[PDB]
């Protein structure tokens, strides 16, 4: 019913997400990768969404690009 994965039996590893919401009666969705450079998940989970990569400007700039498993690190306040 929701994106949280209350009906998913299997988790997805870092860098991935459920392709769609698990339902009580459909085949469990496969895991698919977050959108490289835009979204990421640094920890295994059961949901069908990735996190949005961080931004930097406000006295800050990018230091390391967001990866599928690691949020963007910022730098100089």
């Amino acid at each position, epitope marked *: *019913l929701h994106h*949280d*994965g*209350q*009906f*998913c*039996h*299997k*988790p997805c*590893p*870092p860098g991935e997400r459920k392709a769609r919401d*698990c339902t*009580v*009666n459909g085949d*469990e969705p496969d895991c698919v990768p977050c959108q490289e450079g835009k979204e990421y998940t640094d*920890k*295994a*989970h*059961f*949901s069908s969404k990735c*996190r949005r990569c961080r931004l930097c400007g406000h006295g800050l700039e990018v230091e390391i690009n967001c990866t599928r498993t690691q949020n963007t690190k910022c730098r100089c306040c």
Partner: antibody, heavy 132, light 111 residues
Framework: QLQLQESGPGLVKPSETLSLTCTVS??????????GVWVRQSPGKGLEWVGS????????????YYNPSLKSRATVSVDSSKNQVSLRLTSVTAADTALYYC???????????????????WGQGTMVTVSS | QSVLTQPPSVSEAPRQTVTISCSGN????????VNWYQQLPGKAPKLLIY???LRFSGVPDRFSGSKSGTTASLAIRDLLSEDEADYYC???????????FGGGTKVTVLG
């Protein structure tokens, strides 16, 4: 204030089928959705996850998922009128002798918008001995 | 044996500290967070630490957990007698595609 209680026949004979029930109180499992599991412990030994049901009260249906080591001998089902989850285990042998627990799988928040699954509520367990 | 390896026994005197290791590989602890359960003598397991390092409801501060690489660790500082129990680590293994548990660790508070 969820509470769980297992009940079973205590003793069963090899080749027979073991039936257990898990009664849920303090909440309705059919009010929205409930994810229940069975976990067993051979006396003096460790824990082994047996299987799962992710149940939706709305459509009165659930999807199951089992430990492959059970070789499809285990089935889990729900009886919503009784707020009960059940385990059935066919062709038992001495290897199936154990304390049997039911538990709830809950997706728990880490405070950052993220959740991970854990068995956050357990029954007291019921002892099962496979013997003739 | 379990795919997760724990020492069968750790111990120390009251008020000291013990650490329980739980080791695996990339198919389990390396990719997935670890939960810990405490099983008191004669009682059912209860959830102690979840998602590697978070204390579950009402759990006292002397319990803590962390994860590094493919090993999860549970630390119990300022040991009390009542901490004598079996402790189990737990996670997902995506080769077996199921929940797995360590073999359990008995903590003895030396009397």
């Amino acid at each position: 204030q969820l509470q769980l209680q297992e009940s079973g026949p205590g003793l069963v004979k090899p080749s027979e089928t073991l039936s257990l029930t898990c009664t849920v109180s303090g909440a309705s499992i059919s009010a929205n959705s409930y994810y229940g599991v069975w976990v067993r412990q051979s006396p003096g030994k460790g824990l082994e996850w047996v299987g799962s049901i992710a149940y939706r009260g709305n459509s009165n249906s659930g999807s199951t998922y089992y430990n492959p080591s059970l070789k499809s001998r285990a089935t889990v089902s729900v009886d919503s009128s009784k707020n009960q989850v059940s385990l059935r285990l066919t062709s038992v042998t001495a290897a199936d002798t154990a304390l049997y627990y039911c538990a709830r799988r809950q997706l728990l928040d880490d405070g950052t918008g993220y959740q991970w699954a854990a068995f956050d509520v357990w029954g007291q367990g019921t002892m099962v001995t496979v013997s003739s | 044996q379990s795919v997760l390896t724990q020492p069968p026994s750790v111990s120390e005197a009251p008020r000291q500290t013990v650490t329980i290791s739980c080791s695996g590989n990339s198919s389990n602890i390396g990719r997935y967070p670890v939960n810990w359960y405490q099983q008191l003598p004669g009682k059912a397991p209860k959830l102690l630490i979840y998602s590697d390092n978070l204390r579950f409801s009402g759990v006292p501060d002397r319990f803590s957990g962390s994860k590094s690489g493919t090993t999860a660790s549970l630390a119990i500082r300022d040991l009390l007698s009542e901490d004598e129990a079996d402790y189990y680590c737990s996670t997902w293994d995506d080769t077996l595609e199921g929940w797995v548990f360590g073999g359990g660790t008995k903590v003895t508070v030396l009397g």
